Structures are given as structure tokens and as C-alpha cells.
Amino acid sequence: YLLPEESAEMTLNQVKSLRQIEGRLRKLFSLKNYQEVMPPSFEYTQLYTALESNGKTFNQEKMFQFIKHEGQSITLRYDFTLPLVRLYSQIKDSTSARYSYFGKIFRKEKENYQIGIELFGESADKSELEILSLALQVIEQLGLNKTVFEIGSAKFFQRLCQLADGSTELLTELLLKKDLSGLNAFIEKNNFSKELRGLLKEIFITNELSRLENLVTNTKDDVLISSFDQLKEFSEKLSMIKPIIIDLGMVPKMDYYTDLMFKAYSSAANQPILSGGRYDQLLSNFQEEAFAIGFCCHMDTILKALERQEL
């Protein structure tokens, strides 16, 4: 027979690969003392659409939903981070917490298996190094031959947008399409310094730490030179594990991304194999202010990449 165009089908092999990787990542996680949690498959539509954005309402278009007999709107697991953040709320004794997860979410786009970890409570500095370090170690278990690891800063992105006549909605679209020409048309409609111009034009196409550091420091902007410096440190402390790439032209995925954010890519696949960052904001949606940071591995993309690679 035919199958629904919403249902995915993994080959007997892909399942072996998936299960091999998990076994390995499971040692790694438990070895780092991360407890696995299995979030419920059903959630209240409220949770999601609500805690996902601000401005014009997030959409329930990609969600599978139905009404309950009690007459409420329930949604199939759409996100793994939210439920785990909630689980942390429900511990009153303010302490550290390392959660991991291995499963799939359900989304709709003309499986969606994921593996990830969350770090709540731990000090700020210690966590960022922990998560980044860990992600690097996860990438080294996938078996992918050529992969880059990119780090960015939402604080840098935001400062940049403010200094750029505060056109964050516009510059976001420019960066997304690396629209060099439109960026150009953008710079000549405004009264930006030489510095800001030199920077905007460059961050769009180079990760050369030396090229970058100059442009930033010339702007003589404290918030920009500070954010870059923080990325530069990470670049140095982690380099021995794997060369790190700084993308000042990175556009924070979620509006709640605090500062650090990072993505990992494999030449054999267009989407990222791993993405994560810091998002303390989400913690406020429940209890009080914490230091929440984590990352997610997109198994579908990783397995897709392992195959192409093979050929």
C-alpha cells in the first residue's frame, strides 16, 4: 500500500545506525551524569504557541492537534525543551540539573527524531563550557567525516541591530539571505559610520578571526567588542578539541536566545546536525531566573548525511 505523506519510514539499516549512535551518546551523557527524561506525548496547546515567541502569535499550523472530551486543545509533542524546563520548575530545592532526551517531535512541513541535553541551575561560565565541550564530543561520535562547529552571540546580533538604526526586522532578513546587494542598498539609505559599514559588509562573508577582531574593535563599541571577545575565548579554549568557527552574521533562531548560540554542520547535509544555545528567558516563564542552556541533535539530518557520505 501507500503511506500518509506525514509518516516517515526508516530502513532497517538507518534504525541500526540510529540505535548505534544512541548507545554511544547514552554512555557519553550518563558518563557526564545527565539523566534521561521521557516527556509526555500529549501537551496542552497553550504551553507551546505561548512560550515560543512574542509580537504576532506563534503558529499552530505545524502542530497536530485535537480536542479532548473535557473540551480542551491538546497538541502532540512539538518541542522537547519546553517540557524539560517545566520538569525543572517542579523541583523546589534550587539545584543543578542535567536532562537528556531521545525521541521524536511531531511537526507538519510540505521522522523528526532528536537527541539532546539540557543544563539548568549550574553557574553561568561553567555551563557554557560544559555544553560546548559536550556538543563537540557528540559530534565526534556521529561518524561524520567533514563537519564544522559554529558559535555566535545573540547579544552581538542585537547590539548590531540597534546600532544599525534599529532596523532589526530588516537586517535580520538581509543576514538570512546574506543579501550582499540589499545590504548595500541598506547601508546607503542610512548614516552609518565607516566602521559600522566595514563591519556589516564583512560579517556577512568571513569567519577569519583576525579580519573580524579588527573590524569589531574599530567600532569602539563596548558591547560589540565584549561579545566578540567572549566568542574569541571559547574559540581558544575549545580549539584543541576541534577548530571553532565564529559567525558574527548568525541570526538567533529563537527570540528567547540569551547570548551564546551554536550550530554544527556536515558537508553532506544542508540543514544543521546540531544546534543549541543559551535561553535563560524560558526559565522565567515558570519559576525565576536561571542559566539554561542546551543543544539538540537532528538525527534525521545526521543519518541522511551518513548515507550521502557513504557514497
Binding site: 539571505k177 546574506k178 543579501d179 550582499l180 546587494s181 568571513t206 569567519n207 547535509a269 544542508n270
Partner: protein, 200 residues
């Protein structure tokens, strides 16, 4: 190497023109996938095919027009270079009296580009009924299948050679250099080197 894809149309000329005019080897014989000294394997085909190729990673770079990119559903690419070479433009064409005609019904527009047409009247805060026509949209209003049309107007002749006239301009069309995101990521070197060498 660096795989490219170009639209066989008027655009294919704009590319070989810049390529050559950029110290890049240019050997044009027809066939479909050839190589060059600069190590630039090229492919040719229709706009929506260039995109389909660039989408499936069959190529890294690709050249097409804004009109194709705007209508096409695809969006996952980097529009690095923009040869402001043409003078074409998306425009709402119709008979002179159109502006002052008072239909008590929804305007029927015929266009080769449903998406661009729906998007335009979206900003115009007006509801219409689109009629998809793959060819000479000018017939649209002539044979009487639509009150107006939304198409690419350059010299304005085709319209004027049927009593039609631009009622308003929508957006400037032009050839664009688009790059597959994954390539740019792992070939950023050459890609940017070529981008610059073509920006003169």
C-alpha cells in the same frame, strides 16, 4: 570544483558576458553540462529548473531572475550578487479606462505568476481572482478572460501594441546570483573570490 547552473534565456547571455568580462574562461558551443579551465562545471536549463538544481545540491551557484525567485516556493539560498543589468519590471497592466472603471465585482487578473500577483494585491489591500495563464497574458484582457494582468513589462511595447498600459509598477526584475547555503559554508573561499571578481 565549482558547479554552476544558468537559465538558457536572455539571462544566459548576461552571465557569459560578465564571466568573460571578468577574466573567466568562456567557451560556448548545444549541450548541457560542460567544463571550463577555471574549473567551473556549468549546466543549462529553464529558470524553475536552475532553482530545482540548486535546491537538490546538483550545483553550488545558479543564475536566475528575481521574477523567477519571487514566484518560486523555494527560499533556502543566498542571493550574493545582483547584476543590475536589465530594465524589466513587474507591473499591473490593463486598458486605460481600468482605473476609472467601477466594477461591483472582484477584479479578475490573469498572470503567469499567481504568487507575485496574490502578494501584490495583498499589500494593495484588495481581493481579486487570479487566472493562471502560461503564455501571452496580454490575451487575458483582450479575449476577455481578465480585467487586467500582472506580468513583466520592459519596453512597454507588448502592452501598447494591444491598447494596454502600465497601471502601476510592482518591483524591479533582474538577474541574481544565488548560492546553495551548504556550499557557501564549505567553499566560502572560491565562492566569495568569484563573487568579488564579478562585482566589477
Amino acid at each position: 570544483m565549482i558547479k554552476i547552473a544558468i537559465t538558457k534565456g536572455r539571462i544566459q547571455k548576461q552571465v557569459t558576458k560578465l564571466l568573460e568580462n571578468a577574466d573567466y574562461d568562456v567557451e560556448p558551443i548545444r549541450e548541457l553540462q560542460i567544463k571550463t579551465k577555471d574549473d567551473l562545471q556549468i549546466i543549462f536549463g529553464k529558470p524553475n529548473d536552475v532553482i530545482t538544481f540548486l535546491e537538490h545540491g546538483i550545483v553550488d551557484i545558479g543564475f536566475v531572475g528575481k521574477d523567477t525567485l519571487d514566484e518560486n516556493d523555494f527560499d533556502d539560498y543566498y542571493e550574493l550578487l545582483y547584476l543590475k543589468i536589465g530594465q524589466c519590471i513587474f507591473a499591473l497592466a490593463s486598458y486605460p479606462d481600468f482605473s476609472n472603471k467601477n466594477f461591483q465585482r472582484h477584479k479578475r487578473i490573469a498572470s503567469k505568476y499567481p504568487r507575485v500577483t496574490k502578494k501584490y494585491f495583498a499589500q494593495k489591500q484588495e481581493d481579486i481572482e487570479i487566472i493562471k495563464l502560461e503564455g501571452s497574458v496580454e490575451l487575458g484582457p483582450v479575449v476577455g478572460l481578465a480585467d487586467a494582468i500582472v506580468d513583466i513589462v520592459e519596453t512597454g511595447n507588448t502592452l501598447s501594441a494591444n491598447g494596454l498600459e502600465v497601471i502601476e509598477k510592482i518591483s524591479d526584475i533582474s538577474t541574481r546570483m544565488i548560492v546553495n547555503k551548504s556550499s557557501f559554508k564549505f567553499k566560502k573561499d572560491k565562492i566569495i573570490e568569484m563573487v568579488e571578481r564579478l562585482e566589477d
